[PDB]
Amino acid sequence: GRLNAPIKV
Amino acid sequence: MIQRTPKIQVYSRHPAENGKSNFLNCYVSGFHPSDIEVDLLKNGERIEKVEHSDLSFSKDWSFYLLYYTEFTPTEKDEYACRVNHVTLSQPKIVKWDRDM
Amino acid sequence: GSHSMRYFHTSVSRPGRGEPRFITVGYVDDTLFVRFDSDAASPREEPRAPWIEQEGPEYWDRETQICKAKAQTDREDLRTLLRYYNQSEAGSHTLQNMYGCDVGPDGRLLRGYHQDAYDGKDYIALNEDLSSWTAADTAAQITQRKWEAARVAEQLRAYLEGECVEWLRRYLENGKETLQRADPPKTHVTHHPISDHEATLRCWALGFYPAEITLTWQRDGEDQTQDTELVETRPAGDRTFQKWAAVVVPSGEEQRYTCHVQHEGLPKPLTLRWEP
Ligand SMILES: [Cl-]
Numbered sequence: 001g002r003l004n005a006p007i008k009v
Numbered sequence: 010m011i012q013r014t015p016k017i018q019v020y021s022r023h024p025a026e027n028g029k030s031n032f033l034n035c036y037v038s039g040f041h042p043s044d045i046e047v048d049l050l051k052n053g054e055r056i057e058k059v060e061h062s063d064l065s066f067s068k069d070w071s072f073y074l075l076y077y078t079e080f081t082p083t084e085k086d087e088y089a090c091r092v093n094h095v096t097l098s099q100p101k102i103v104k105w106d107r108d109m
Numbered sequence: 110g111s112h113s114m115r116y117f118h119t120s121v122s123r124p125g126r127g128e129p130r131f132i133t134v135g136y137v138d139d140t141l142f143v144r145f146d147s148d149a150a151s152p153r154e155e156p157r158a159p160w161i162e163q164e165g166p167e168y169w170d171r172e173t174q175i176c177k178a179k180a181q182t183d184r185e186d187l188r189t190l191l192r193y194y195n196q197s198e199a200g201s202h203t204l205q206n207m208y209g210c211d212v213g214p215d216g217r218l219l220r221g222y223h224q225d226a227y228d229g230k231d232y233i234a235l236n237e238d239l240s241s242w243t244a245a246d247t248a249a250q251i252t253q254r255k256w257e258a259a260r261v262a263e264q265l266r267a268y269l270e271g272e273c274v275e276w277l278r279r280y281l282e283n284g285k286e287t288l289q290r291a292d293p294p295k296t297h298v299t300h301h302p303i304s305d306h307e308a309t310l311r312c313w314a315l316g317f318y319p320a321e322i323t324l325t326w327q328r329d330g331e332d333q334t335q336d337t338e339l340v341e342t343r344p345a346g347d348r349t350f351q352k353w354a355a356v357v358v359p360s361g362e363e364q365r366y367t368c369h370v371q372h373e374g375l376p377k378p379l380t381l382r383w384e385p
Contacts, residue, residue, distance in 0.1 A: 001168070001276040002116060002135070002175045003208060005264045009186045009193075009225070009233075009252045010200075011229050022345045024315075036343045041229035042203055043121055063144045064132045065117050070205055070226045072119075077346050108301060108311070109353070 013071055014096035015040035017103045019089065025082045025107040033080040033105065035090035038073035046093040047076045050102075052086060082107065110373060111219065112138055112288070114277040115209035120183035122202050129187055129204075131180035137280050137288055139319045140348065145176040152177065160284035190227050193248035203228055208265075210273040221269030239266035292318040292349055293374030298383045303357065310383055311355040312368030316345070323371040324354040328362070 015037040022032035033056075035047055043064055049056040062075040080088065088105035118133040128147075134157075135143040142158040154172040156162045183204050191198065208223040224234035233242055233249040233256075240262050244253045256262065281288050294314035301309040314324055320342050326333045338355045345351055358366055363383045370379040 001272060002172055003223075003265070003268045003272075004171075004175050005261075005268065006178060006182055007256070007261055008182050009189050009255075013229070016341055018340060018343050020343065020351070022347060032346050034344070034346060036341075038341055038343075042201065043119060044201070063134050063141075063146060064119055065134050065141075066119065066205060066207075070229055070231070075344055075346065108299065 011041060012096045013039055013041040015045065015092060015094055017090060017092050017101060018109075019103050019105045020109065021080075021082070021105075021107065022077075027083050028081060030079060030081045032077050033088055035076045035092075035103075036073065037076070037092060038067070039071045040073075040094060040096075041071055042095065043072045044095065045072075045074065047074070048091045049076060049078055050087075050089040050091055051080070053089070056080075111211060111213050112277060112281055113209060113211045114273060114280070115207060115222075118179060118183070118204075118206040120180070120187060120204045122187050122200075124199055124201070129180075129184050131176075131183055133176055133179070137277065137284065139350070140284075140288060142280070143172065145173070147180050158284065158287075160280065160287070163283065190248070193251060194227075205229075208269070210269050210277060212274055212277055216274065216278050218270050218274050221266070221273065223265045223269070235262060235265055239269060287348070290318070291372070291374035292316060294322060294370060294372050296368075296370055296379060296381055298368055298381050300363070300383050300385070305360070307357050307359050308363075309355050310358050310363065310366055310368075311353050312370070312381060313351075313353045314370055314372070315351050316349045317351075317372055317374065318349050319373065320350045321373070322350070322352055323369070324352055325369045326354055326356045327367050327369065328356075328365050330367075333366075 016039040018036045020034055049059050056078050059076050059078045066072045089102050091100050091102045093100045114137050116135045120129045120131045122129040131147040133145050134141055140158055142161045143154050144157055145154040154176050187204055205226040210221050211219040213219050221239050225232045231245045233244050233252050236243055242253045244250045294317040297313050299311045314322055326337050333356055336356055340353055342350050342352045368381045
């Protein structure tokens with residue numbers, strides 16, 4: 001099951 | 010922009026036996042960018058309805074794909090993989106050799 | 110033995126041809142189990158292994174939402190990266206991300222990963238500490254500053270040590286028929302005359318799973334590394350992998366050459382010779 005935390009560069 | 014030319018292997022799922030159904034694979038790997046065109050050929054003509062894996066990549070970030078179709082090898086039929094990529098000045102044709 | 114779970118993501122821009130295409134796949138060890146493609150007619154995360162099919166509708170809905178949201182943040186990221194590298198809007202660019210975990214036979218975390226590449230080059234990676242970053246260049250240092258400010262590493266560590274490990278344990282149980290079975294290589298040696306003076310010996314490994322294998326040739330007991338053609342391990346399409354290693358052998362020397370095979374499905378490494 002995937003990571004849910006949105007991350008932007 | 011960096012570019013890495015594909016490695017190309019064309020081979021069968023099982024050791025070839027003339028007249029016995031099998032799968033013909035073309036595995037392209039080690040390449041960047043990811044845009045690539047791959048045909049499978051029978052007696053020099055494109056095989057229709059070839060399927061392929063979803064784009065994925067290796068530890069070093071280079072991409073790989075598998076193109077594949079069912080085939081029944083014979084003594085006389087010739088099979089090949091034809092690949093086009095930005096690193097290639099002309100399409101690369103790799104012939105299927107049952108001993109590789 | 111030890112196991113891994115990895116998710117791979119690629120977004121590729123295509124100016125003038127709509128929005129970037131997003132493709133992500135998930136693996137346990139060398140087994141693909143989920144995929145998502147934004148160019149599908151109705152994009153959803155879809156099963157690719159039998160043992161994930163039992164997950165219920167809430168799993169597929171949640172996973173699909175995560176994938177769609179990552180497709181969107183990747184499109185924002187591609188726009189940001191054009192700024193960071195002073196690039197024009199005209200060209201195609203690539204953004205890759207991999208994350209996941211490795212565990213030992215007891216299920217405990219051995220190592221976590223979370224790393225990105227832009228245009229095929231390392232961009233920023235979470236270090237093995239799961240607490241600090243390696244930035245490749247001054248553009249990635251801008252990202253590192255933002256991620257330090259927002260305590261991104263702490264959120265990744267929590268996932269990688271917790272959920273990642275727990276999902277992998279669940280999958281390894283549900284998939285115990287296949288994920289916990291090694292298929293050993295089927296091995297043989299072939300001989301291919303080149304001229305009157307030499308012939309190739311090719312040592313084959315077929316039908317094996319997982320992909321990791323070692324195939325080497327020795328002559329009089331000495332490794333022939335520089336003189337061995339070793340092809341990349343390649344998928345058969347039936348879950349298994351193939352590999353061969355070849356040497357050019359002068360006439361009459363065949364019995365001095367031995368092929369050595371190591372694989373987790375073999376209780377002891379194998380030694381083979383050409384058998385005329
Ligand atoms: Cl979408």
